[PDB]
Amino acid sequence: ELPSLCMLNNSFYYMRGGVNTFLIRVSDISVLMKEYDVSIYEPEDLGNCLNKSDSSWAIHWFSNALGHDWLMDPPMLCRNKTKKEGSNIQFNISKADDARVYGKKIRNGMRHLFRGFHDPCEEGKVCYLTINQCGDPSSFDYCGVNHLSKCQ
Amino acid sequence: VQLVESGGGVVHPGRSLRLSCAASGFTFGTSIMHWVRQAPGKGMQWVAQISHDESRKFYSDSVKGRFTVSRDNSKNTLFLEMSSLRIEDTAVYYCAKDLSPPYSYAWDIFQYWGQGSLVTVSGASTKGPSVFPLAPSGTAALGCLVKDYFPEPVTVSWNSGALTSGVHTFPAVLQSSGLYSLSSVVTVPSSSLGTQTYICNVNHKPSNTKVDKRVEPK
Amino acid sequence: DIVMTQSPESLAVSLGERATINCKSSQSVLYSSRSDNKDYLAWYQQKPGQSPKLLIYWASTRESGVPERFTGSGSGTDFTLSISSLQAEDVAVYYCQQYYSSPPTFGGGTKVELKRTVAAPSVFIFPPSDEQLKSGTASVVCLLNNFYPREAKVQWKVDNALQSGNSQESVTEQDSKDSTYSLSSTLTLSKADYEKHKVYACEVTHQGLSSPVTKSFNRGE
Ligand SMILES: *[C@@H]1O[C@H](CO)[C@@H](O[C@@H]2O[C@H](CO)[C@@H](O)[C@H](O)[C@H]2NC(C)=O)[C@H](O)[C@H]1NC(C)=O
Numbered sequence: 001e002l003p004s005l006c007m008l009n010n011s012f013y014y015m016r017g018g019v020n021t022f023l024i025r026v027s028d029i030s031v032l033m034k035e036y037d038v039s040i041y042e043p044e045d046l047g048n049c050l051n052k053s054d055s056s057w058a059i060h061w062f063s064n065a066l067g068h069d070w071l072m073d074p075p076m077l078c079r080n081k082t083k084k085e086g087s088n089i090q091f092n093i094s095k096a097d098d099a100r101v102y103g104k105k106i107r108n109g110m111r112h113l114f115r116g117f118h119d120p121c122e123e124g125k126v127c128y129l130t131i132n133q134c135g136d137p138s139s140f141d142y143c144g145v146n147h148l149s150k151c152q
Numbered sequence: 153v154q155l156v157e158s159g160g161g162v163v164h165p166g167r168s169l170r171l172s173c174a175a176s177g178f179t180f181g182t183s184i185m186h187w188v189r190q191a192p193g194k195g196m197q198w199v200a201q202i203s204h205d206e207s208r209k210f211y212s213d214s215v216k217g218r219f220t221v222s223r224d225n226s227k228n229t230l231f232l233e234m235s236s237l238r239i240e241d242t243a244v245y246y247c248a249k250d251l252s253p254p255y256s257y258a259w260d261i262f263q264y265w266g267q268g269s270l271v272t273v274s275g276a277s278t279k280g281p282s283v284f285p286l287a288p289s290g291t292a293a294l295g296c297l298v299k300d301y302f303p304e305p306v307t308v309s310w311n312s313g314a315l316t317s318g319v320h321t322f323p324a325v326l327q328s329s330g331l332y333s334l335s336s337v338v339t340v341p342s343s344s345l346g347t348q349t350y351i352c353n354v355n356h357k358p359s360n361t362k363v364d365k366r367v368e369p370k
Numbered sequence: 371d372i373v374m375t376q377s378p379e380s381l382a383v384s385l386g387e388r389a390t391i392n393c394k395s396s397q398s399v400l401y402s403s404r405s406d407n408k409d410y411l412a413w414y415q416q417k418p419g420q421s422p423k424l425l426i427y428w429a430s431t432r433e434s435g436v437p438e439r440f441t442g443s444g445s446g447t448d449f450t451l452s453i454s455s456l457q458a459e460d461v462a463v464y465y466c467q468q469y470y471s472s473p474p475t476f477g478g479g480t481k482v483e484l485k486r487t488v489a490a491p492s493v494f495i496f497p498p499s500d501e502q503l504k505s506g507t508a509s510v511v512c513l514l515n516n517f518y519p520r521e522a523k524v525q526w527k528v529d530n531a532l533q534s535g536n537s538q539e540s541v542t543e544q545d546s547k548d549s550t551y552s553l554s555s556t557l558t559l560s561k562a563d564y565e566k567h568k569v570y571a572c573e574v575t576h577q578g579l580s581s582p583v584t585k586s587f588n589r590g591e
Contacts, residue, residue: 033256039404080401084210084472085257137210155421196414196422196465196476212473246422260474261412262467263433265421284499286511289587293494293513297502297556320515322540322554335540335554337513339492370497370591 003058006151007116012142014151017058020050021134023142026120028127032077032090039075040089049078049087050133059089059131066091066109074102079138086138091129095121103127153177155266157247162272162303162358163237173230173247173266180228184250184258187221187232189243190268199245200232201258214240237273244268276302276330280359283352285367286337292345294367295337296352300329307355308336312364315350345369372397372468376477382485382519383456391480393449393466400446401470410470413442413451416479417462418543425464426451458484461544484549490578491517491553495571495585498564508564512572512585514553516545523575524555527586529567533557565589 134143286295426442571586
């Protein structure tokens with residue numbers, strides 16, 4: 001079942017959930033907003049982020065593979081599949097006093113999943129983990145077989 | 153805060169036009185912008201969206217690939233390049249600012265709107281109006297028919313701006329021909345008909361017509 | 371995608387009374403859980419020519435500076451915009467808008483006018499000018515001047531045979547002072563046909579008229 005991983009550069013990581021492909025990048029830019037977007041509480045909310053049902057699981061694996069504990073840890077924000085902006089899932093991994101701890105979590109998890117990961121974050125500055133399904137408008141050119149050749 | 157649309161007039165089907173929107177009173181370079189059109193009818197329809205940096209541009213399926221949204225943050229100006237125009241594109245084009253905070257995804261909430269610029273697409277070339285009188289027969293009605301003209305608008309004044317009270321100038325009606333027809337009337341006391349001189353002063357700037365016709369009783 | 375339908379097309383209320391626009395969406399626009407229940411619905415005011423303005427968002431939250439007489443309400447599929455006490459200034463078109471799904475969609479909008487006492491129309495007929503008759507066409511015009519409500523029936527009659535399709539109507543916007551309307555009805559005929567008939571009549575049926583009013587002429591004159 002397991003989703004095959006891969007990396008290209010310092011802010012270009014990938015995941016393949018059977019047939020589907022997912023692009024994992026780090027950003028400093030708070031793209032998705034609280035109060036406007038879908039909070040993900042449990043794995044069942046995930047189906048509201050992807051067109052497919054056979055997408056939901058790969059995401060669910062990875063989030064938990066990172067260190068996300070659904071019961072206590074903060075809900076990740078996601079862009080509804082109603083908005084034709086694409087499918088976006090972001091984790092608030094900021095080095096700010098609030099999500100200070102959660103920041104350390106997902107980062108250690110990443111360093112464990114991807115040998116080639118280094119903390120790109122700035123101290124006392126916002127930091128986010130953005131994921132996009134491949135084929136989506138939000139995923140762009142980065143999901144082409146030009147970038148995806150360099151991988152397993 | 154200010155949004156002022158410019159450009160837009162009359163075009164032949166298939167030709168191109170460019171609309172610009174001048175922005176002031178907010179941080180233009182950081183906010184998401186939109187183009188919403190209103191066709192003669194009622195419907196308010198979304199046309200395009202652009203990000204603060206132009207990386208993400210989205211179009212409505214009706215315009216997709218014919219229109220091109222662009223922006224110049226240095227001049228705080230928004231642009232819509234409209235090519236291969238069709239009659240269906242006839243609308244007032246409003247430029248609007250998205251409520252979405254900086255670097256946030258589009259909220260599709262239109263906080264501020266401009267006054268809008270009219271864009272008319274028709275194959276009808278420019279034609280001047282033919283002005284016929286609506287001859288009167290305790291109060292009397294006098295008038296002017298302003299038939300077969302293109303494009304809109306036409307300006308009617310009575311007694312060169314002296315006659316004002318009880319002047320009803322009806323909105324233009326587009327005929328089968330694709331040419332506009334308009335009517336203008338004025339209620340006057342019956343007693344004045346014999347004395348007073350009544351002349352409507354019609355002005356259609358696109359065909360450069362200026363006419364002024366005297367309405368004589370029957 | 372989502373279809374916003376608004377109702378009633380145009381309403382008229384006395385100064386001070388309550389105005390009530392209805393808005394209905396084809397799919398719910400509600401997002402729930404956390405604790406928060408938000409309705410992805412907005413209201414806009416558009417006076418003539420002027421820039422449309424944002425009134426309400428989240429279906430109930432007033433945009434900064436909107437007076438408290440404007441009340442946004444509803445949930446899921448059914449929404450209502452209420453103007454607690456109508457002011458002359460409040461005359462405009464009002465549009466509801468969905469922002470739950472892409473693309474954002476708007477209503478057809480209700481038009482808000484003032485409700486005033488019945489006012490009978492003054493009826494007038496005009497024969498085609500000789501100037502126009504030499505031009506090869508003929509235009510008979512009928513004016514309904516200063517009346518309320520907008521609703522009235524104009525029937526054209528040529529030699530006692532009723533006319534259809536050959537006429538066009540035009541109506542002024544409710545007057546700024548007396549809030550009455552005026553109507554233009556133009557019967558367009560071929561010079562040829564016009565000369566073959568004698569009696570030309572225009573029949574107005576209104577709320578303010580005791581009985582239909584007829585304005586007519588003979589071609590002989
Ligand atoms: C993601 O996490 C950061 C850190 O907790 C949030 O940023 C802080 O927001 C609070 C309340 O608005 C402020 O008092 C802090 O000063 C902000 N910290 C920073 C780093 O400047 C951030 O808002 C969260 N994401 C969103 C958009 O909700």
